[PDB]
Curated annotation (Swiss-Prot), chains A, B:
Mg(2+) 1 binds at D115, D120, D152. This is Inorganic pyrophosphatase. Homodimer. InterPro entries: Pyrophosphatase, Pyrophosphatase_sf. The gene is IPP1. It comes from the Eukaryota. Present with 68400 molecules/cell in log phase SD medium. GO terms for biological process: phosphate-containing compound metabolic process.
Length: 282, 282
């Protein structure tokens, strides 16, 4: 059973969310199995950012057990700006654990090195997710985002508990039940960083969302890269903390890491600067 | 100076927000001057619904001093649904006090009776407003919405404190600085009740946003409709509570109504049913 342990108040620099397995903190990056059901390709998706929020929360590569923490910018919290007609993130945003976009080699489909992070997932169900949630999802497709020149695949998925889950089985079903969502997805990822002064992003395949079969192949590739990484066999792990508490045959295995985590110290959400309210027309 | 007096928790039936003038409650409908600066065309806007929220809050016509409360439908709190790509209301939504869409006469521009409510205002500034807030705005234009067959003008305005206020003078400036907003506004008002099982709404003039001069004329007409109403001269005031504490020459003036209001009893927001998360693709 997966639960969360929150340190601090949301929207503060001290805020951390560890994922617990039977009450014990585990690595959100390495200890959560990629598959909830291997035979049926049902994946475990770690949610970082709830739909319509702005905080750039992420499984941290630099801290032990990789808790979800907010990224920083010039000493303060990092937030994505609202880009008309969108409000914050337009998907329950997260990643699949036990995956890695290898930054050491150039990926052929995109002709660029990976972004050094677990593969990303866009969960399109109706219910807004919570930070640290581990939900079970079906893969529907994938888009080849080049984010600031780096391979940055976006898997399109749906929570198996969603009322529409039974009807969503491949990429064509997203346009059938969520018309316009894919085009908006393409747009959002192209322009979301422009308010921060970054250039517009680009997609391979002219922004085409590849199907489930394709998605599964890429997911497997990123899972294989993580297998090499966690074994300590990457040519360069980029200082990522590979500490884990469920993989005994790995060099960085350490059960005590779980017991070192401070107890929950939940505090109510802290105020977010009103500047984040701003709607950008770009 | 205008402040707010909150009773109960947001998202509850007991929730009320009274507008105070120098600490004393006044009618949000009748006691707040329409004009902050008449000759410069600056108006006082009463905010009911902050941008990106769902609750259908409104200056209530049938309670003394007309506090803002949440509208209901079949005994349950009324919430507007999310219509892709929109999240809740896409503007700081409110009304102009001392105005009334006369339901007793068919309006010639729209060929329909008014909706019995003060004239509506869509404030397009960057900052998210707060319920019960009294802000000064400039009128830029107006759209003739026919909401469920009733005259329902929507004034397009900007908070004078907005960084872009000095550059926004007429309706054309909205397209320049807020490209796509007018089109999305037309769409929003046409489709927002479809998730509730209601027909698509319609606009007069093919949805054209009339200019500042046109907007001023309609605002003034609704102000005149309210002058007849407050004087007790309407053929049918529809049970509207006309009690006021600042208009001594009106029949319903009452210098005791203000002190009859209970003191603030602000509570934390109550939870909103998770079904309100749902994004409708209609
Ligand atoms: Mn990521
Ligand atoms: Mn990225
Ligand atoms: Mn990424
Ligand atoms: Mn109204
Ligand atoms: Mn209406
Ligand atoms: Mn109205």
């Amino acid at each position: 059973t997966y639960t969360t342990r929150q340190i601090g108040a949301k929207n503060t620099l001290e805020y951390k969310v560890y994922i617990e397995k039977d009450g014990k903190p585990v690595s959100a990056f390495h200890d959560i199995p990629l598959y909830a059901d291997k035979e049926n390709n049902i994946f475990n998706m770690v949610v970082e950012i709830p739909r319509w929020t702005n905080a750039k929360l992420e499984i941290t590569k630099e801290e032990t057990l990789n808790p979800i923490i907010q990224d920083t910018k010039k000493g303060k919290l990092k937030f994505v700006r609202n880009c008309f007609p969108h409000h914050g993130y337009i998907h329950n945003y997260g990643a699949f654990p036990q995956t890695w976009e290898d930054p050491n080699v150039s990926h052929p489909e995109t002709k660029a090195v990976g972004d050094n992070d677990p593969i990303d997932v866009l969960e399109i169900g109706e219910t807004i997710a919570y930070t640290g949630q581990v939900k079970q999802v079906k893969a529907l497709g994938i888009m080849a985002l080049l984010d600031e020149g780096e391979t940055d695949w976006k898997v399109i998925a749906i929570d198996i508990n969603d009322p529409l889950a039974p009807k969503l089985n491949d990429i064509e079903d997203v346009e059938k039940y969520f018309p316009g969502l894919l085009r908006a997805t393409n747009e959002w990822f192209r322009i979301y960083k422009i308010p921060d002064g970054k250039p517009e992003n680009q997609f391979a395949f002219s922004g085409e969302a590849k199907n489930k079969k394709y998605a599964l192949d890429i997911i497997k590739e990123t899972h294989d890269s993580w297998k090499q990484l966690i074994a300590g066999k990457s040519s360069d792990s980029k200082g990522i903390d590979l500490t884990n508490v469920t993989l005994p045959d790995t060099p960085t295995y350490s059960k005590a890491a779980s017991d070192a985590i401070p107890p929950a110290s939940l505090k109510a959400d802290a105020p977010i600067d009103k500047s984040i309210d701003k709607w950008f027309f770009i």
